[PDB]
Amino acid sequence: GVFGCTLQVMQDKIICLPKRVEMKGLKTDLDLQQYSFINQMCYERALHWYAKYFPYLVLIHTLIIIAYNSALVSKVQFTVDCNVDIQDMTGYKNFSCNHTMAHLFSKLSFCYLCFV
Amino acid sequence: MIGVFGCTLQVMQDKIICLPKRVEMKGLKTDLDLQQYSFINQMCYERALHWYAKYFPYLVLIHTLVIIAYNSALVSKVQFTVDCNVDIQDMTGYKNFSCNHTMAHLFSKLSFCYLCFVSIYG
Amino acid sequence: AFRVLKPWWDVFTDYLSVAMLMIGVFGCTLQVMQDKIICLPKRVEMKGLKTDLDLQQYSFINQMCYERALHWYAKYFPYLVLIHTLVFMLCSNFWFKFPGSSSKIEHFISILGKCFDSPWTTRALSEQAKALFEKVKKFRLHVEEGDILYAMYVRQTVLKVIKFLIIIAYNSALVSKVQFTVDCNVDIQDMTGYKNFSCNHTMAHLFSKLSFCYLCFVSIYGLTCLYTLYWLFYRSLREYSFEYVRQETGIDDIPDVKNDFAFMLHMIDQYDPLYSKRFALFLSEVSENKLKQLNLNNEWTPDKLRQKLQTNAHNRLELPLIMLSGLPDTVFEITELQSLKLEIIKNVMIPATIAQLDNLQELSLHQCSVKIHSAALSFLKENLKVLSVKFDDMRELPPWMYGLRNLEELYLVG
Amino acid sequence: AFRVLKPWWDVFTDYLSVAMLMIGVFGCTLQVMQD
């Protein structure tokens, strides 16, 4: 769980965009900041707390597992959606997001389950 | 060790993001540069955020060098999101702002583990 | 060298100074890292309020209103803390960094180390320390003229007190001066197009709180000084008289020491009274006499005295002595000797161990000062038959020889 | 050998020299970093 924690603190950053709207560009005319805000919002809300705590959970347990870890590995995925009411804050409601480390833990989690 | 860790990231990433609150769907372009936004970060960080929250990395450090009565009721004080009606009108064109910071949920979970550590010690 | 010289209040002050340095270095580190003012032009449903200024003018305004508006004390506070901490360190360590007194301090620490390390201290309270008694006496005659070390320490404490007073005085007023926000009217209009500005910097409130705790620390430091002030201005430490060792080992000597020695004895007592008790003996005159007797008994031994023996003029097994400073015990272990010869041997005490020399009938005395104890004197009164005595200035002549009732022949010269 | 050769003024000058050296190195650090 130590290795996942290092990636969680440093590398685990989520990127987000608003979903609801020759192919032209799709200028969303929002600057960097509320983009970071939306990153935080859909990081806290949509991202599953087990996944957020997964680097911590392995660290805590290393220092019943099969019953609930089996379902929560399939619970997490690469992409994510979230309908959080940032309307009147940025004017958008439904967002798509993805965080960089999603598939890596999915490969890492499956091998970790075999050990236990 | 917990006290230094909290102070370490507080120097690094204790940053609160802020937006002016009150205003198919489109963008909400605000036409404010990063300068005003850092200014608003400072202002609402000072005003809205609770004092114990800001000094949480320092309260832990001082107590280690030298709890349950007040910190138990102070855990519910820290919130993920937060709001501020700061009189920054005629300064940036807004009055109300919604803000929050990465450390909000981090400290709440960090406080939960620390409150256990003090309990076993006492 | 650096340990037995520190009273508890001194160690507390030293660790307070360490905390001072830590506070200061943390403050200066934060100032160098993240001390940034942020500024905006002041006097301008609600919409945006774009100011059409690129980043560079923003930095320039930051610098300008940081220098002008933000108070100089708010900026310099960590650096002030560093300078005051360093001056405190210097004024604390100057007591030992001045070589003139440092040499005396070094010799003092060394002699007490050798003294409480000496087993003969315990032996006298219940060999080579004899050679250390002269070091003790030379140092004690050396530093009775001083007391300037005490005055220098007092002046150091006074300087600490005065600087404390000034620091607390001005900081009490200047804590309120710092503020989170600030307004500046800088005549930068028509060069950047604005004159009124609102600014605030990250450090401000933090420093306030930091300042507060810092002040508290300084305050307790001052209390330490206050303690020493009582310790300086009520005990009258210019004179030291044991009156305890004199009562516990029954030694009427070691009456007093001068102001410098009084003070250093006091400091040792504050550190460890047991070390003062251990060091007390190397000054006793009677203990010095006992150590002289001990070394004398050790180095003159019974085989040596048996070899020295012979027959005198009056056909008696005699142990002639020509150079001595006392009476060896092994001399009294050879009971078969019948006579004794002494030349230039002063400070002589005859113990009742001469009564061990039961077959004693002649004695030869030549220019020696001899005092007998009452039991030994009675033994000689009931045992002497012949005597030889020589006196130059009537001093070596003993009066007690006028008490021996059984003397037959007395030989005198001079 | 290395101590008894330093009168009081010599030691005080040495301390002043050390203080000046740290002042100078601090100034150079500030110039390279923030100036």
Residue numbers in the entry:
A (entry chain G): 39 to 59, 95 to 136, 275 to 327
B (entry chain A): 37 to 59, 95 to 137, 276 to 331
C (entry chain B): 16 to 59, 95 to 176, 236 to 523
D (entry chain C): 16 to 50
Which sentences did the original study use to describe this structure?
The female patient carried a different monoallelic variant in LRRC8C, NM_032270.4:c.1168 G>C, p.(Val390Leu) (NC_000001.11:g.89713738 G>C [hg38], NC_000001.10:g.90179297 G>C [hg19]), or LRRC8CV390L, which also occurred in a de novo manner. In P1, the insertion of a base yields a frameshift in the amino acid sequence leading to a truncated protein, whereas the replacement of a valine by a leucine at position 390 leads to a moderate increase of the side chain volume without altering the hydrophobic character of the position. To investigate the biochemical properties of LRRC8C constructs carrying the disease variants, we compared the elution properties of overexpressed and purified WT and mutated human LRRC8C subunits as fusion to green fluorescent protein in HEK293 cells and found LRRC8CWT and LRRC8CV390L to elute as monodisperse peaks at the same volume, indicating that the presence of the point variant did not interfere with folding and oligomerization. Even though less pronounced than in LRRC8Ctrunc, related features in the map of LRRC8CV390L indicate a similarly increased subunit mobility. Akin to the truncated construct, also in case of the missense change, the ESD region is the best-defined part of the structure, obeying C7 symmetry and closely resembling WT. Despite the distinct difference between the two genetic variants, one (LRRC8CV390L) resulting in a conservative replacement of amino acid, the second (LRRC8Ctrunc) in the loss of an entire protein domain (representing ~50% of the protein), their structural and functional consequences are similar, leading to a strong increase of the subunit mobility in an oligomeric assembly and in consequence to a pronounced increase of activity even under isotonic conditions where VRACs are usually closed.
Volume-regulated anion channels (VRACs) constitute a diverse family of ion channels that are ubiquitously expressed in mammalian cells. They are believed to be essential for maintaining cellular volume, as they are known to open in response to hypotonic stress, enabling efflux of anions and osmolytes, thereby preventing excessive cell swelling and burst. VRACs are hexamers composed of five closely related paralogues of the leucine-rich repeat-containing protein 8 family (termed LRRC8A to E). In contrast, when expressed on its own, the LRRC8C subunit forms a larger, heptameric assembly with weaker mutual subunit interactions and a different preferential arrangement of the LRRDs.
